[PDB]
Design a protein around this ligand. Sequence first.
Ligand SMILES: NS(=O)(=O)c1c(F)c(F)c(S(=O)(=O)CCO)c(NC2CCCCCCC2)c1F
Ligand SMILES: [Zn+2]
Length: 256
Amino acid sequence: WGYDDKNGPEQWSKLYPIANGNNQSPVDIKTSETKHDTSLKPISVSYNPATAKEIINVGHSFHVNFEDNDNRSVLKGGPFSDSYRLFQFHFHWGSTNEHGSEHTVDGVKYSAELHVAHWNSAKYSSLAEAASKADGLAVIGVLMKVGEANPKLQKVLDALQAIKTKGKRAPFTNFDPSTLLPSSLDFWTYPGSLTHPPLYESVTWIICKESISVSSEQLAQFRSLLSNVEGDNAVPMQHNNRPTQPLKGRTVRASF
Ligand SMILES: NS(=O)(=O)c1c(F)c(F)c(S(=O)(=O)CCO)c(NC2CCCCCCC2)c1F
Ligand SMILES: [Zn+2]
């Protein structure tokens, strides 16, 4: 499963008919149709850098995974009454700077998107139990706007030379991904899904209002990762964003 025309977004509904469901992600957030909700609390993140574990090339992307044996690293607040435990962050990007984000805001496409993913450890005991539950996962999405280089990306970008090809992995430790979030944590929230197979409708999205920057050359570092395994012809990972999906009557709520 990937993003090419035969294993990609258009092919997913064959094995995952939930691809055409009613809570699919990402979406285009229309700011004139949001609803400002006052039961929403501020998002609170508290991540312990000792939980960073490893960085992995998974062929269509790369992931930074975290130890999630306990609640050292948690997300609270916002729409949640439960604590969600951090387990991973990753990015999505596009083939050129003029698209690549997953979420869009009033039709505007950004160059990339950061996802910081968490599972509900108040209700469930593992990521695998939580992944399929409506209340199982919480993902912070941060739109990344091409512009000045972002120095907070540097440990991540420096690490990619160790995981160039599909399946490579390396320790990635002592890193707090709250350093990647924007200074404002004003947000939109809506009930949705994983944006890749198995596309479970188990994600409460937290989309930050403020973007963070990325340069054109930092973007090119993500696109130079390779989707092939070591020794095969190099096939760069040019893109890995899913198109936006119909809202199907859901409401996007605004914290602000
Ligand atoms: N954008 S996202 O947050 O919905 C997302 C992906 F796009 C994605 F591609 C992945 S993947 O690389 O691991 C491919 C299949 O999952 C995960 N990973 C999680 C998805 C949750 C299902 C069970 C494992 C939890 C990892 C994932 F969370
Ligand atoms: Zn993602």
